[PDB]
Write a protein that binds this DNA or RNA. Structure first.
Length: 126
RNA sequence: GACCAUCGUAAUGAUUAAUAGGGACGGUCGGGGGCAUCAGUAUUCAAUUGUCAGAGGUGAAAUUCUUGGAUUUAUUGAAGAC
């Protein structure tokens, strides 16, 4: 038998979050960000930061007795970028290499039916 | 000469139907209009949630929010717009 958690990977262009919960999603088991592992604000989204965050989450998951994780990848979404940030892929690869069994992978990036006005002018960032 | 009847003669008297226009009729077509009426996810916020240091934001920083629990996570809501 295998104990399943849910790895919510939030990958933005500024930071990466590796957040493991129960299947209900109410109880957090482990939460680590890229900025927890690197001291420089520019490197919080980096693939390296995301790897270190994922490794630490995986250690804590083993202590609690989680053997397997469902992956929910999330970009910023809404009125912002729907592309996941650079550490999304690195975090996932790190979780797999740490010896957690990867279950189902889903994209849960929030997509509007139609949107409130995006930030920027009509002339855009310049 | 006017004028009103009645009989008579006559092929008795209405040009097409514009690859002009209008109108009717027929089945349709359309993100055309108006008034009601349905959803939709998102965004912000607020109740209940777990969690533990950063989260935000950038070319790089700072302003800002934060161990009274941010951000992240789930649950049920409202609001307005689209």
């Amino acid at each position: 038998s295998q104990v399943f958690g849910v790895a919510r990977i939030y990958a933005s262009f500024n930071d990466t979050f590796v957040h493991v919960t129960d299947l209900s999603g109410k109880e957090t088991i482990a939460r680590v960000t890229g900025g927890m592992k690197v001291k420089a604000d520019r490197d919080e989204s980096s693939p390296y930061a995301a790897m270190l965050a994922a490794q630490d989450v995986a250690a804590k998951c083993k202590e609690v007795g989680i053997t397997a994780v469902h992956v929910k990848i999330r970009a910023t979404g809404g009125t912002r970028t729907k592309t996941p940030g650079p550490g999304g892929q690195a975090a996932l690869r790190a979780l797999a290499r740490s010896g957690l069994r990867i279950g189902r992978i889903e994209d849960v990036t929030p997509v509007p039916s139609d949107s409130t006005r995006k930030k920027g002018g009509r002339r855009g960032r310049r």
